C-alpha cells in the first residue's frame, strides 16, 4: 500500500483493516473497491483500525523466535527471523525485535500475526530496536430474531457503533427477506437523508407530511419523520398496519415522538407489530458520561452565560473546531457575537433554522457552532470540543389561576440531554482526546414538562381499532397522571385541532385550547380578547397587529403559550397567523 | 493504497539476524518512547 503526493503498509484481516497510527494519522483511502473509513485508534499503542475494531489477538510467547514480513519501497517484500528481547515498560513488558528498514515499511506482519512492526527506539549508543506493538483484540455483529410480534426491542447504541451505516441497513435487509411492511422513523429529515443514503440500493420511500397516506403493492419500506407519522395518524384512517417499526433516537421528548412511542407500544401489545427503539440513552439510564468510541476528556469549569470581557482564555486558545450548547437562541446570539469579536467565525443553529445552517457545518469550514437542544438528536459534527453549561429552557403548563404555558429557565438539563450533548464528540479518533467541557450538574426531575401532556393530547386523538386505548410508552407514562382519553375531541374539534397544529404552526397545548373552545380555524378573534397580562411584548414594546379586516389591535391572546413569542421567527409566524394571512 | 502483495506465510529460508537487547523504556502519550 502506497500514498503519493509507501509511507506504510496495512493488513486486512477478518474483514477489517489494521495499521500503524503515524503512517496515516486517520486519513481515508479508496481502493478499486469501496472507500475505507477509520473506526478505532490507540495512540499509546500507535495502532489504528479501519472499518472495524481490532481483530487479532495476543500471542507473544517471550521465548519463541518470531519473524517480520518486510515490505520495502522500490522492491519486493523480504522475510527475516529474530529472537526478540524484552522491552521493559514501567507498567508491563512487551516484546522487542531489533530490526531496521527504510522509512515507510511500518505495518509489516509478524509470525498468525502477533504484532505490527513499526514503532521503535534508536539508542545513540547502539543500533535501532523495534517493538512488537499490538493491542488486545475486541464485537458488534448480526442481530437475532427481534422481528417477532409483541416484542419491543431497545438498542443502547452509542455513537458511533455503526448504527446508521451498518446496523440499520442490516435490520432493513432482514426485514425485507421476511417480507415485512417495515417502518423507519427518523427524528429529523437530515437524519432521514443520512439513512436513505445509508440505505442506498434498498427499496426505501421517503414520505412527505404533505401526503396523508401513500400505498403501493410492490411493497417497499416507509421512511418518515416522527411528526409525519403522528400527523398521518391524526389525518387518515388509511394508516398501514406495519409489523416492524424502527424508531431512531427514541429518547426524543418532542410531543410527536412521545405520542408515536405510545402508539407503537400499543400496536406491539396488540400483537400486530414488532418494535425497535434505538437510542444511546434509553428511558432507564441516568449516566451523563457514557462510554464512547474515542476517549473523552471530561472537564468541569465555569462557563460564560453572557458576553465576557476577560478571563476565559481557555475558550479561544483552542485551535480545533468547537460545539457550544446554549439554552436559548438569544443567549446564543450573545455568545456568538462575543466570539466573533475575537476573530472566530460562528455558525448558529436552532430548531427552525437547522435545515438552512446545518449543511454549512459540513461544507463551510468553521471555528464555532452555537446550538439549542436541537443538536442532541442525530446531529453529527467533525469538531473536537463540546462546551456545555448544561442549561436549557423548558415549557411548563402553569395551572395556578388561568392555565398558561411559560418557558422556565435557564434550568439545568436532563441526564440524557447532557449525555447527548457530550455524545456529539468521542467518536472520531484524533491524536488529541476530545474534550467535553461542562459546568454544573443535570436534574433528574423533568415531569413538569409540557410535552408529556401535549403528547397525551396527541395520543388520545388517534383513531384506533376500539378495542383499546392508546396509552403512553411504559417507562414514560408515569411522568403524567393525566387520565387516559381525557383530551378526546369529537368530530369538528378534532379536525380543527389537527389543522391548527399543521396549517397554523401552533404548539399542541395552544392548539388544543383553541380547538376545544369550539373556535373555527379561520376565526382569529381569540388573539385579541385576552387579559391585560396576556399582552405580548416585542422588544419591550406592546405588539400591535393589522388584522385580515384591516383593523389595528394589540396582540393579546386569550390563551398564552410562551413558545409563540420566544423567538423573532416564532413571533413572526404567529403574527402572520393573527393577521389571518395563513 | 496499492496491493499489499502479502501472504500470511512462513519462509524458513528467511535470514535469522538481530540482537536481543533487554531495553527499559517509558511510553509516550504520543506513541514514541523514552530512555531510562
Automatic annotation (TrEMBL), chain A:
The source's superkingdom equals Viruses
Q: Which residues of the full protein are shown?
A: 1498 to 2092 of 3387
Q: Subcellular location, in the record's words?
A: Host cytoplasm, Host perinuclear region; Host endoplasmic reticulum membrane; Host mitochondrion; Host nucleus
In the record, what lineage is assigned to the organism producing the protein? Viruses, Riboviria, Orthornavirae, Kitrinoviricota, Flasuviricetes
Q: What does this protein do?
A: Regulates the ATPase activity of the NS3 helicase activity. NS4A allows NS3 helicase to conserve energy during unwinding. Plays a role in the inhibition of the host innate immune response. Interacts with host MAVS and thereby prevents the interaction between RIGI and MAVS. In turn, IFN-beta production is impaired. Interacts with host AUP1 which mediates induction of lipophagy in host cells and facilitates production of virus progeny particles.
Q: Which positions fall inside the Helicase ATP-binding domain?
A: 144-300
Annotated Helicase C-terminal domain residues: 295-476
Q: What range(s) does the Peptidase S7 domain occupy? A: 1-142
The positions flagged as active site in the entry are: 22, 46, 106
Outline the subunit composition.
Forms heterodimers with envelope protein E in the endoplasmic reticulum and Golgi. Interacts (via N-terminus) with serine protease NS3.
This protein's name: Genome polyprotein
Automatic annotation (TrEMBL), chain B:
Q: Which organism is it from?
A: Dengue virus type 4 (DENV-4)
What lineage, starting at the top, does this entry show? Viruses, Riboviria, Orthornavirae, Kitrinoviricota, Flasuviricetes
Function in brief:
Functions as a signal peptide for NS4B and is required for the interferon antagonism activity of the latter. Required cofactor for the serine protease function of NS3. May have membrane-destabilizing activity and form viroporins.
Signal peptide (from-to) = none
* Range covered out of full length: 1396 to 1431 of 3387
| Stated name of the protein | Genome polyprotein
Location in the cell reads: Host cytoplasm, Host perinuclear region; Host endoplasmic reticulum membrane; Host mitochondrion; Host nucleus
**Subunit organization:** Forms heterodimers with envelope protein E in the endoplasmic reticulum and Golgi. Homodimer; in the endoplasmic reticulum and Golgi. Interacts with protein prM. Interacts with non-structural protein 1.
Amino acid at each position: 500500500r502506497i500514498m503519493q503526493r509507501q509511507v506504510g503498509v496495512g493488513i486486512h484481516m477478518e474483514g477489517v483493516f489494521h495499521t500503524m497510527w503515524h503512517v496515516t494519522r486517520g486519513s481515508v483511502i479508496c481502493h478499486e473497491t469501496g472507500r475505507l473509513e477509520p473506526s478505532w485508534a490507540d495512540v499509546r499503542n500507535d495502532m489504528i483500525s479501519y472499518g472495524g475494531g481490532w481483530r487479532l489477538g495476543d500471542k507473544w510467547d517471550k521465548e519463541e523466535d518470531v519473524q517480520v514480513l518486510a515490505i520495502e519501497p522500490g522492491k519486493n517484500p523480504k522475510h527475516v527471523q529474530t529472537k526478540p528481547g524484552l522491552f521493559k515498560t514501567l507498567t508491563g513488558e512487551i516484546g522487542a525485535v531489533t530490526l531496521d528498514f527504510k522509512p515507510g515499511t511500518s505495518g509489516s506482519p509478524i509470525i498468525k500475526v502477533i504484532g505490527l512492526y513499526g514503532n521503535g527506539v534508536v539508542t545513540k549508543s547502539g543500533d535501532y530496536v523495534s517493538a512488537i506493538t499490538q493491542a488486545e483484540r475486541i464485537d458488534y455483529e448480526v442481530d437475532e430474531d427481534i422481528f417477532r410480534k409483541k416484542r419491543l426491542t431497545i438498542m443502547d447504541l452509542h455513537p458511533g457503533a455503526g448504527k446508521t451505516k451498518r446496523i440499520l441497513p442490516s435490520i432493513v435487509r432482514e426485514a425485507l427477506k421476511r417480507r415485512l411492511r417495515t417502518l423507519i422513523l427518523a427524528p429529523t429529515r437530515v437524519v432521514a437523508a443520512e439513512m436513505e443514503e445509508a440505505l442506498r440500493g434498498l427499496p426505501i420511500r421517503y414520505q412527505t407530511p404533505a401526503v396523508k397516506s401513500e400505498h403501493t403493492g410492490r411493497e417497499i419500506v416507509d421512511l418518515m419523520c416522527h411528526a409525519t407519522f403522528t400527523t398521518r395518524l391524526l389525518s387518515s384512517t388509511r394508516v398501514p398496519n406495519y409489523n416492524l417499526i424502527v424508531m431512531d433516537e427514541a429518547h426524543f421528548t418532542d410531543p410527536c415522538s412521545v405520542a408515536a412511542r405510545g402508539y407503537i407500544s400499543t400496536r406491539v401489545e396488540m400483537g400486530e407489530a414488532a418494535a425497535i427503539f434505538m437510542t444511546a440513552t434509553p428511558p432507564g439510564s441516568i449516566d451523563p458520561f457514557p462510554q464512547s468510541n474515542s476517549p473523552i476528556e471530561d472537564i468541569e469549569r465555569e462557563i460564560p452565560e453572557r458576553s465576557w470581557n476577560t478571563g476565559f482564555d481557555w475558550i479561544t486558545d483552542y485551535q480545533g473546531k468547537t460545539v457550544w450548547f446554549v439554552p436559548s437562541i438569544k443567549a446564543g446570539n450573545d455568545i456568538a457575537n462575543c466570539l466573533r469579536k475575537s476573530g472566530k467565525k460562528v455558525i448558529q443553529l436552532s430548531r427552525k433554522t437547522f435545515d438552512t445552517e446545518y449543511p454549512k457545518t459540513k461544507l463551510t469550514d468553521w471555528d464555532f457552532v452555537v446550538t439549542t437542544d436541537i443538536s442532541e438528536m442525530g446531529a453529527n459534527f467533525r469538531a473536537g470540543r463540546v462546551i456545555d453549561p448544561r442549561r436549557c429552557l423548558k415549557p411548563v403548563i402553569l395551572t395556578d389561576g388561568p392555565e398558561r404555558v411559560i418557558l422556565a429557565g435557564p434550568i439545568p438539563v436532563t441526564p440524557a440531554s447532557a449525555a447527548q450533548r457530550r455524545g456529539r464528540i468521542g467518536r472520531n479518533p484524533a491524536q488529541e482526546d476530545d474534550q467535553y467541557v461542562f459546568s454544573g450538574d443535570p436534574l433528574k426531575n423533568d415531569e413538569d414538562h409540557a410535552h408529556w401532556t401535549e403528547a397525551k393530547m396527541l395520543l388520545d386523538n388517534i383513531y384506533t381499532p376500539e378495542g383499546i386505548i392508546p396509552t403512553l410508552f411504559g417507562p414514560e407514562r408515569e411522568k403524567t397522571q393525566a387520565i387516559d382519553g381525557e383530551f378526546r375531541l369529537r368530530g369538528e374539534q378534532r379536525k380543527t385541532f389537527v389543522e391548527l397544529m399543521r396549517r397554523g404552526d401552533l404548539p399542541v397545548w395552544l392548539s388544543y385550547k383553541v380547538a376545544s373552545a369550539g373556535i373555527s380555524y379561520k376565526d382569529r378573534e381569540w388573539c385579541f380578547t385576552g387579559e391585560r397580562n396576556n399582552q405580548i411584548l416585542e422588544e419591550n414594546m406592546e405588539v400591535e397587529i393589522w388584522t385580515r379586516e384591516g383593523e389595528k389591535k394589540k396582540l393579546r391572546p386569550k390563551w398564552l403559550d410562551a413558545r409563540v413569542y420566544a423567538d423573532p421567527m416564532a413571533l413572526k409566524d404567529f403574527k402572520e397567523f393573527a393577521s389571518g394571512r395563513k | 493504497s496499492l496491493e499489499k502483495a502479502a501472504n500470511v506465510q512462513w519462509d524458513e529460508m528467511a535470514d535469522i539476524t538481530g540482537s536481543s537487547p533487554i531495553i527499559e523504556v517509558k511510553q509516550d502519550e504520543d506513541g514514541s518512547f523514552s530512555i531510562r
